[PDB]
Amino acid sequence: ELWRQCTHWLIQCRVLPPSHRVTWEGAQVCELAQALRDGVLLCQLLNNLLPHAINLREVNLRPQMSQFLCLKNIRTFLSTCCEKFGLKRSELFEAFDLFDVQDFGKVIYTLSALSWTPIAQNRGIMPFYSGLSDQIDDEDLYDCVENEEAEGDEIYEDLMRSMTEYDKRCCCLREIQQTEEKYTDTLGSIQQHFLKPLQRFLKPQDIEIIFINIEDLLRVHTHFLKEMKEALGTPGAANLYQVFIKYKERFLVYGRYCSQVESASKHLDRVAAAREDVQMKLEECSQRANNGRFTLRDLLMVPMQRVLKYHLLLQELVKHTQEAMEKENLRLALDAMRDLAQCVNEVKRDNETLRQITNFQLSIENLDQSLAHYGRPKIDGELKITSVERRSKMDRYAFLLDKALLICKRRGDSYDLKDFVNLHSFQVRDDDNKKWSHMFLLIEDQGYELFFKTRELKKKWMEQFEMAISNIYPENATANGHDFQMFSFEETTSCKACQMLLRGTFYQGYRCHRCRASAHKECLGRVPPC
């Protein structure tokens, strides 16, 4: 069979893990299409053939809760698929031929075409339905995809590159001191050769973005390193677990950094095209500072990576510290540097969420409010509604967010907002497998029925509606006289119950407008009375 040929080829292209369900005796065609319908493997495929065909910031790496994000991946695929691979528009399928399996036959043709490209074969790899929509009705899946932080992870490992179980431990203690010395003077190189020299050329609105950050990082580490060095020089080196813990809250600036970086850096890149006197000098600063091995972009990615490495270094120092009192202490600093890394990962996720939201906002016409105010996307896709003014099933597109349902009519790539629904006032009420009969009710208890193609779709939406509503009105929200509501804190915040940090940059938790308290959703009832 020809889809079996595709499979094999996709495996040869390192796109499909050779242990995946379309590999097993019995594998249906539908299992292949299931694995391609979010355009992710397809996007990776192109990159495995033409390195850098598609920049990852253009790929929606985990789009399964979103028809919108899957479609954008497939369009990115098809589009670079003709613009960078030769293929003619009569040789590449149309999005829904894939995402709604309206003609998977033509998707397989496109790949075969790809396999015969002067590029596929230029690489050693040999070239090569109706009932689909029904059959259809994944940690494994993305094993072969570049995860989002690999680009930076190599810049970092390049920059840092250089028995018994005491030589093993000491070997680790030297990795910690050396990478730190090297990290610390790297920040210094960025200031001295970049941020200072550049200050003059650029408005304090073009550079002011990066400098306050880098400079604060240089000061913290410059000091960090002094105290790291001392605790190491002293016999044994047991004061070390204390340096890490002492500096944890100081290191929370990495949140602000790993939050503003990606934008001042895209801004730097815009002032690239928009000037010659600039583009020409960030080759100088480069050439001068390190002799052209690293651009300023390259270096701005380094702090995001460095902060994520501390728990890893300590994790290994801990494997080789046999002493009982030693271990339980290093595991304290390890606890602190792992939390640090978890906070930064929270900032990375909210960064991404905000990109998706901006994405929806640019494709939604007749929308007069900022989507960010309505919490985070839960799921978006095609359903059928009737309200109390219609009865004939109206086909509509919906975006669900924590605080709102956007009912819309899709017009190609643009979505017209026909009915914003403020979910503060609504509640979910449930009610033979006939395709499109699976409905539950969305009712205000002082005032729509939603139909889903399949039982599983309905379950997946109803589940999201419940999480959304639970976020609006969590348990104990009104407990002890409080009035807790979702809230995006601007400044680093801790909870008035678990005393630990609210994580992220965007709807980190809840706030009682009355006592000013802040809490995690779970910590809510443990919060001292209003």
Chain residues that interact with Zn ion, rule: CB under 5 A: 482, 495, 498, 512, 514-515, 517, 520, 523, 530
Least gap, CB of 476 to Zn ion (angstroms): 11
332 touches 241 (CB < 8 A): yes
Question: Residue 76: in which H helix or E strand, if any?
Answer: helix 67-83
Residue 383: phi and psi, rounded to 5, are: -140, -175
Compare residues 391 and 516 and give the one whose CB is closer to Zn ion. Answer: 516
**What's the closest the beta carbon of residue 504 comes to Zn ion, in angstroms?**
13
Shortest Å, Cβ 197 to Zn ion: 44
Report the residue number, 336 or 379, with the smaller CB distance to Zn ion: 336
Residue 32 phi/psi, 5° resolution? Answer: -65, -55
CA–CA dist 295, 309 (Å, integer): 22
State the nearest-atom distance from the C-beta of 508 to Zn ion, in Å. Answer: 10
Say if CB 421 and CB 406 are below 8 A apart. yes
Q: Which is nearer to Zn ion, 266 or 514 (CB)?
A: 514
Shortest distance (Å) from residue 503 CB to Zn ion: 10
Query: Shortest Cβ contact with Zn ion: which residue?
Result: 495
Query: Which of 527, 424, 517 shows the shortest CA–CA distance to 476?
Result: 527
Other C-beta atoms lying within 10 Å of the C-beta of residue 427: 14
Pairing outcome for strands 493-494 and 518-519: unpaired
Complex with Zn ion: residue 462 or 498, whichever CB lies closer? 498
- The torsion angles phi and psi of 339, rounded to 5 degrees, stand at -60, -45
Tell me if 461 sits within 8 A of 379, measured CB to CB: yes
In whole angstroms, give the CA distance from residue 527 to residue 512. Answer: 10
Q: How far is the CB of 29 from Zn ion (least distance, A)?
A: 49
Q: Which is nearer to Zn ion, 86 or 525 (CB)?
A: 525
Nearer residue to Zn ion within complex by CB, 437 or 494: 494
Single-letter residue type at 77: F
CB of residue 501 to Zn ion, shortest distance in Å? 8
Give the CA angle between residues 122, 128, 130 to the nearest 5°.
140
Is 188 or 525 the residue whose CB approaches Zn ion more closely?
525
What is the distance between the terminal CA atoms of the chain, rounded to a whole angstrom? 68
